């Protein structure tokens, strides 16, 4: 047994929005990130805007009351928590970072895809081209490497299709 969601149908909420991107681009980055994981699993995601959700998404800086403060611009870009109640599943993004929906350094969708991988119960990959690689990498299209696919399917199984 290792931290995994008992349910297959999960909920998420964007608590607050970054001023770096328009609301729609933030919504798109998050949705498409969840899409990558739901594509290869029987896992389902639903955005809510009121009340508490399984995966809470937020943009915060420095000390933000979770015992893992951010470090200003650079360094730590974002982090997340393994499946569980309360803070479990939540993903936090450093606001001191400049967030983008393009090649300009620090693509939100690319990072979110990684951090949501943690939200579902994945560890870091050592494969340089894997989404679950801890260092920031961007090569245009962000897609799951076989290591990512095998990791998440080893927990939740294959897609229904």
């Amino acid at each position: 047994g290792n931290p995994r969601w008992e349910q297959t149908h999960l909920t998420y909420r964007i608590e607050n929005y970054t001023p770096d991107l328009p609301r729609a681009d933030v919504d798109h980055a998050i949705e498409k990130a969840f899409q990558l994981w739901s594509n290869v699993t029987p896992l389902t995601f639903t955005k809510v805007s009121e009340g508490q959700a399984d995966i809470m998404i937020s943009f915060v800086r420095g000390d933000h009351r979770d015992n893992s403060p951010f470090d200003g611009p650079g360094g730590n870009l974002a982090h997340a928590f393994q499946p569980g109640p309360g803070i479990g599943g939540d993903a936090h993004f450093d606001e001191d970072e400049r967030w983008t929906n393009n090649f300009r350094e620090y693509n939100l969708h690319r990072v979110a895809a990684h951090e949501l991988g943690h939200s579902l119960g994945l560890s870091h990959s050592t494969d340089i081209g894997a989404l679950m690689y801890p260092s920031y990498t961007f090569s245009g299209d962000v897609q799951l490497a076989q290591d990512d696919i095998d990791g998440i399917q080893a927990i939740y199984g294959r897609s229904q299709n």
Binding site: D66, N67, S68, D71, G74, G75, N76, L77, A78, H79, A80, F81, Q82, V111, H114, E115, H118, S123, H124, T126, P134, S135, Y136
Partner: protein
Amino acid sequence: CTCVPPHPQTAFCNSDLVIRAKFVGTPEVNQTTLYQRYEIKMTKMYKGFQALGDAADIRFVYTPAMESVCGYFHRSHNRSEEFLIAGKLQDGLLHITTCSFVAPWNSLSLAQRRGFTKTYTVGC
């Protein structure tokens, strides 16, 4: 956790302690605070040693227990290997993350190994 790996230069100025040390054994974990500590046999200090504030031990490096929240997970077979630890001083304990500059000493280039000797201090 997502990190932009720091260039040795900028990590030197940001960190409070840029020591050389060896990791003794398996990480000790406190499953109530979700932090983790590695017992380290310290060999040499390049910053430190000035000590502002502080600070101390140093034979324990601290890091979050969970990899997802930037807990540093040590990837080393041999136990006698020397590592360059470049971390922050919080309270009185040396802290480190996935994003902290931790690399084996021998794997560093000549410019890098000369950098910690007395070159990066100029770049701050």
